[PDB]
Structure formats: structure tokens, C-alpha cells
Amino acid sequence: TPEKEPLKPGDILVYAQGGGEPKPIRLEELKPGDPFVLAYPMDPKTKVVKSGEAKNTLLVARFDPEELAPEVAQHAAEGVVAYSAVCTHLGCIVSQWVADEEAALCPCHGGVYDLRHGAQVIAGPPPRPVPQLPVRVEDGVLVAAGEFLGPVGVQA
Ligand code: FES
Ligand SMILES: [Mg+2]
Ligand SMILES: [Mg+2]
Ligand SMILES: [Mg+2]
């Protein structure tokens, strides 16, 4: 189904939504240092949000660009970073924030990913970082700028 299609470069990032019209994520809405938001990709011409496929679930956060690791900054936009939100341990959505680590926490078994430093696993059983999603800003809206930088979710 269109709603289960994979994320594609050029897709518009929208806030995770129930029904109703989607809301694109605008750069100016994200305050550097604030907790991440959960997002999905939306096909820019059909406006179909690809939220029926869990492996399209994203977390999106903004930091001061100087606080990002250079490798992360390569794929960031005005300090905004995005990653897959599917835990690489057993696939739970990495839905919680760790304020004093600026990290994403998985409530299932306590995986913690260090968002400014490439979602390095700093606690729990995730075997590898959630992959980064390159982003760019177009007319103030966040857009996927490439494929995920590695496989999503639970792998061999
Ligand atoms: S599914 Fe995330 S830590 Fe186990
Ligand atoms: Mg605002
Ligand atoms: Mg650092
Ligand atoms: Mg625990």
C-alpha cells in the first residue's frame, strides 16, 4: 500500500499524526536542545504519509551545529538531525528523551542512543546505532536528503 511504501529521498518530514491533515516539520519550530519529535516521511506530491510502515518512523532533533560530531554534521541541516526511531535491539520505537544526555531512550530494554554523536549506543542492548537519515531544508521545511545511512531496525 502507498502508506507502507519506504521512505524516499525528497520526502517531506511530518510530525507523527493520527488522522487529519499532516503537519510538515519546519526548521523554525525546532528549538536547539529541545527533546526530539517522532516523524514520518510524506510523499511530496501525493501527500501520502508513509506511516503504515514502522521502519519509516523517525526521530528528529535540533542541536547547536557545533555540538554535533563532524560525521553527524555532514548529514545535518542547520543543526537538525534525524535518525530511524526503530530500536536495533528488538524493534521497539525509541520514544523517550534523556535530558541530561541529549539521548534517545528505548523503553523496552533501556537502549540509549547518543544523538549528537551519531546515536552511539551508550546504554542497553542495541547492537548498533540507529542509522542517521540525511536531511535538508527546503522553503523552511525538513526533507529527507538521502537514504538511511545503514539498515533499519532488527537485523541478523
Ligand atoms: S527493543 Fe530497544 S532496547 Fe530492546
Ligand atoms: Mg512555533
Ligand atoms: Mg561532543
Ligand atoms: Mg530498566
Automatic annotation (TrEMBL):
<keyword id="KW-1015">Disulfide bond</keyword>
<dbReference type="GO" id="GO:0051537">
    <property type="term" value="F:2 iron, 2 sulfur cluster binding"/>
</dbReference>
<keyword id="KW-0472">Membrane</keyword>
<keyword id="KW-0001">2Fe-2S</keyword>
<keyword id="KW-0411">Iron-sulfur</keyword>
<keyword id="KW-1133">Transmembrane helix</keyword>
<keyword id="KW-0408">Iron</keyword>
<protein>
    <submittedName>
        <fullName>Rieske iron-sulfur protein</fullName>
    </submittedName>
</protein>
<dbReference type="GO" id="GO:0046872">
    <property type="term" value="F:metal ion binding"/>
</dbReference>
<dbReference type="GO" id="GO:0016020">
    <property type="term" value="C:membrane"/>
</dbReference>
<keyword id="KW-0479">Metal-binding</keyword>
<keyword id="KW-0812">Transmembrane</keyword>
<feature type="domain" description="Rieske">
    <location>
        <begin position="46"/>
        <end position="144"/>
    </location>
</feature>
